[PDB]
Amino acid sequence: SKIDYLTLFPEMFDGVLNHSIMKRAQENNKLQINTVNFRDYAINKHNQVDDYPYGGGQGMVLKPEPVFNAMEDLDVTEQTRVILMCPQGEPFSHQKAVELSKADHIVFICGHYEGYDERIRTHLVTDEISMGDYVLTGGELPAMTMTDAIVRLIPGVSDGLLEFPQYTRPREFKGLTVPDVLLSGNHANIDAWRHEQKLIRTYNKRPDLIEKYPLTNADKQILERYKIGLK
Numbered sequence: 001s002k003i004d005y006l007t008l009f010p011e012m013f014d015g016v017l018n019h020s021i022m023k024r025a026q027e028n029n030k031l032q033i034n035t036v037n038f039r040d041y042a043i044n045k046h047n048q049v050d051d052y053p054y055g056g057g058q059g060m061v062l063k064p065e066p067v068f069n070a071m072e073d074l075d076v077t078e079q080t081r082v083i084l085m086c087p088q089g090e091p092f093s094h095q096k097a098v099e100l101s102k103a104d105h106i107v108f109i110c111g112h113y114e115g116y117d118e119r120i121r122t123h124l125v126t127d128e129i130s131m132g133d134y135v136l137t138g139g140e141l142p143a144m145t146m147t148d149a150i151v152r153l154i155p156g157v158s159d160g161l162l163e164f165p166q167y168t169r170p171r172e173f174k175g176l177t178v179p180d181v182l183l184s185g186n187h188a189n190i191d192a193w194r195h196e197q198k199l200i201r202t203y204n205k206r207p208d209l210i211e212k213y214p215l216t217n218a219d220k221q222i223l224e225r226y227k228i229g230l231k
């Protein structure tokens, strides 16, 4: 598996690529990563990478020329996945992280442009993906974030409830005391207490999850005595 980033700000990938999980995984001969710059493939390098839109338009538009040239020498194939970071792409998701982790070659087209030449989309891009309804400056951070979720899912690199509260040393800290049950060594009571907390927190902060949860008699009894202790 190999992952390529087509970007104008390749320096912006410095920390991410050289540090943490991707830095380790690259070294294990698990994936090859390349950071390629658009401007390098500009036909003229003076009116390059982008230009005015035919028929008028709000902003500048990424030109097809540099992009097809980049794909050409990146050895892109019909099995490759050419992902375009765009605001109106499909929101990224876990099922997509799996599908892409199962792919050999991935090419991210990262950009800030008000628009992308349609010929790029119709004949190169296999996938268009966003991070969500909000507005970002460009595609690099989304490309890196998607890479993170995909890479950890490459080999070799919920119960329907919110999680239970967790605590560690010290036991007492600014008057804030770890629940005693967690120090008692009674694993049945520790699990039961954790389960009660899961139920109560989900009740308070995600009641929709309680509705989708197969509540036992004990679970109902727990919620009632909680909503009665409240008064």
Ligand SMILES: NCc1ccc(CNC(=O)c2csc3nc[nH]c(=O)c23)cc1
Pocket: 085, 086, 087, 111, 112, 113, 114, 115, 129, 130, 131, 132, 133, 134, 135, 136, 137, 138, 139, 142
């Ligand atoms: N006015 C149109 C317009 C066009 C491009 C941009 C630059 N944005 C991106 O390249 C982007 C990539 S993935 C993603 N996910 C969520 N939001 C985003 O903005 C993005 C912003 C606004």
